Each structure stands twice: as C-alpha cells, then as structure tokens.
Amino acid sequence: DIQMTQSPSSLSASVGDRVTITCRASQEISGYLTWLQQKPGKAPKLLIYAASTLDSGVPSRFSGSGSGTDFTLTISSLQPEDFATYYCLQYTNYPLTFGQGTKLEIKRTVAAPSVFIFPPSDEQLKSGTASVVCLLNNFYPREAKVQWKVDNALQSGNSQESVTEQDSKDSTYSLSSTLTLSKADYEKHKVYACEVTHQGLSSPVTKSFNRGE
Amino acid sequence: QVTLKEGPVLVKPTETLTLTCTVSGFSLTSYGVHWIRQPPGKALEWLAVIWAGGSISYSTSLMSRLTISKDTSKSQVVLTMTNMDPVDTATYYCARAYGDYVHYAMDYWGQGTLVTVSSASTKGPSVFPLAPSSKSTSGGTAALGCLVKDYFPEPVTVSWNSGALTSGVHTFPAVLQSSGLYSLSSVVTVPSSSLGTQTYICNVNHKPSNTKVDKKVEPK
C-alpha cells in the first residue's frame, strides 16, 4: 500500500492567516492527488483533484500544488468556516489511501462562558434517577474546568462532559457537564452547584440552586 | 440533482452488513461508485469501488469479506460485508467517481451511514426537559433544553420547533455511559420575555428504534 504522510496533524490559526498542509507519498503518484475537507458530522467535500485543479464552487483561497510525491494545500486568508479536518488522497493505484488528516482549529480572542444550571426534572425523578446539568455557553478557548459541589462537598466520578465543535461564525465552544446521582442521594441534600474556571473569568463562577425552591 | 442516499444500523458480531447506495442524477453505467468508511475519531479508509463497466476492486485486507452488486434499473449499488466485528463500527460512505477508472474526482458523497457492531440490544431514548428558570437566566436571555438519555445505538437527531428554531441551538456530542447506553443534551438560548408566550419543543428522532418524541419544555 502507498503510504501518505500528512503534516501537521493539528494546527491553530487566526482569521485572515495563510495555512499550509503538506502530504508526501511513499511512491510516485504523478498528479493523482485529491484534497478533501470534512466538517464534523458531515461527509467529506472535494476541494482539489489532479493535485492542483480547484473544484468548481470552491473559494479561490484554496490552492493545491505539487506533482510526484510532495504536495501542498494552501489556504490563503483563512475564514471561520474553514475549521475542519483536511485529508489528502492518492488514486494512482489500489487500494486508494488517505493521509491521516489535519485538524484545523480557528484562533480567536478569549471569550468567557455564560453559565447556566438545570435541576433534574420531575419526570426524570419519577424514574428514580437525577441528572443535574451545567451549561457553559459560547466561550473560547476550549479548556474549561467544571467542579460539582453537593452541600459544598466536591464530587468525583459521577459527572460527564461534552463539548461542541467550534461555531462556524464566531469560533466559540459550548460545553455541558452532567452530574448524575441516585434519586435517594439527590433527595437527601439541598445545595447543588457547578463552579466554572476559565481563562476569560478573573475568578471562578458558581451557579447553584436549592432543591425544591 | 446528483445525489447519493444510503439508515443507521446495528449489526451483531459475526453477522452481515448490507448497505444500499441509491443514486440519482446520473447513470451507474457511466460512473463508478466508491465505498469509504471512517471509525469514530479516525481517518477515512477506502473499502471498494464498482466501475461503470462492472469491474470491481476491494481493499486487500478486507476483500474476502466484501462483495458489491449493482442494479441499474433501481439506480442502486449494494455493499455487503460479512463477519462484522466491533472494530468495524464506523460511518460508511458511498461516493461517485466522476471521470474514468484512471482519472476521476470523488465529487459527490452520500450522507454516511453510522454502523454499530455490538451484541447490545436497541433501546429508545427517554427525553426530559431542561426547564428555564432564574437559574438559567442571564440578563434578558434564558437557556432551556432537553436531556436525551439512555439510548442505543447512536445516533439521535434533535431539532427545535420542527426546524424553525436554529439560532443559538447547541446539540452536544453523545456521551457513552458505563452501562453501554448513550446520552446527550440539546440546549437553546432564547429571550426571557418569550418564555410565557413562545412554545419550545425539542423533536427527537432515534431511527434505529423508530422512536420519535416531541417534548415541550415548560417554563418553571
């Protein structure tokens, strides 16, 4: 199999920057080289084929060069909607083989999260479980710390987090943290709080509620 | 319109996957069709191709397990994969090869079919409201949502007010709990002034169990 070595594997750049992704084939592949762009959750999109032919409708800021074994994708004047994983693909011989991808993240200014907390619903409690949700909305960068306190006692091993992909317009992230307790545990204690630490917050933000209030 | 349409499927281990790629806007006697898969978090992997004249090529490591068929009258290409293993869990794509077998461009792709290989049984989701309160009210904006808990396999799709509500919607990637069941949440930020007058309904579709749930999020 023809090995395609793609570099870098992850890259962060600002809007308007020029970015460069390289791809090296282990054998001569002439110009049978394609660049793909894949947004999270979606099918890959064709950017360039025959190493340097821009597919119709693709913005002119995308460009491909090279022939033989060394190939380059250039994105001039990066735009927020260009966050994606990019792949090169050779098709001179079977099996077709891909580079292992380049994840392109968009750099922007620090944005502190707005924090919200949701008690468990009466419907969920009726089934005997209690999930408490803490929401961090529209922040940057991705790094954030969410600590759960029940009656001021630090929780561990009973919460899970999930983060969205970068927004296509403002390049921010959102995050949920879910604390799941037994119904009996939830009904014993009163004060539930999530404390959020983030680079955009001069001091940690705590959102809390008192059960049944 | 040139389209390639492939639903999500659970396959038990050692059993057989059948994927259908139904094409429109072009003839299967003029274009080839490629099959490509992508495990969660990993790179694309090429599987097979059937050319317009019927020639076929398979990934060498998987050739014994793969077969392709074509039905031109139905505009369908069918990929069969036997002896499925949990490492075969992936999103499977079909894609058109515009050109010939030598020079071509993979210009149009199917939406992709999430295939899960697991001995676990299908389960529909429970949908719970994340109610807006003073605890979810920043200034003039309120946050609300839906908790979609305990389903298998992936995926679920979530919309709000039948697609009318899109701005400020965040549907998070699903989390796998130790039980082997998935959970996710979908949230939206709205004007607090609207809580008493505007209806907010999350529309949850879990095709693998044919489950559809509409849950209104009542203000507290």
Author numbering:
A (entry chain L): 1 to 213
B (entry chain H): 1 to 6, 8 to 82, 82A, 82B, 82C, 83 to 100, 100A, 100B, ...
List passages from the publication reporting this PDB structure.
As none of the nine initial candidates displayed significant reactivity to the BJAB cells, an additional nine candidates were generated by grafting the slightly longer Kabat-defined 44H10 CDRs onto previously selected frameworks in a second round of humanization (V10–V18). While none of these additional candidates displayed reactivity to BJAB cells comparable to parental 44H10, one candidate (V17) displayed superior binding relative to the others. The binding of V17 to BJAB cells was further characterized using a full antibody titration, where a greater than 50-fold difference in binding EC50 between parental 44H10 and V17 was measured. In biolayer interferometry (BLI) binding assays, parental 44H10 displayed an apparent affinity of 1.5 nM for recombinant HLA-DR, whereas V17 did not produce a measurable binding signal at the concentrations tested. Thus, conventional CDR grafting methods using two distinct CDR definitions generated a humanized candidate with only modest HLA-DR reactivity, displaying reduced affinity to the antigen relative to parental 44H10. In particular, K60 and R66 in this region contributed the light chain’s greatest per-residue BSAs and mediated several direct contacts with the HLA-DR heterodimer. L-K60 and L-R66 found in parental 44H10 were changed to serine and glycine in V17, respectively. The crystal structure of the unliganded V17 Fab solved to a 1.95 Å resolution highlighted how the shorter side chains could not replicate these binding interactions mediated by the parental mAb to HLA-DR.
Here, we describe the humanization of the pan-HLA-DR mAb 44H10, a murine antibody displaying significant involvement of the framework region in antigen binding. Murine mAb 44H10 was shown to target an epitope on the HLA-DR molecule conserved in humans, suggesting its potential clinical benefit across populations irrespective of HLA haplotype. Using a structure-guided approach, we identify and restore framework residues that directly interact with the antigen or indirectly modulate antigen binding by shaping the antibody paratope and engineer a humanized antibody with affinity, biophysical profile, and molecular binding basis comparable to that of the parental 44H10 mAb. Here, we describe the structure-guided humanization of mAb 44H10, leveraging CDR grafting methodologies further guided by critical insights derived from the structural characterization of both the parental antibody and intermediate humanized candidates.
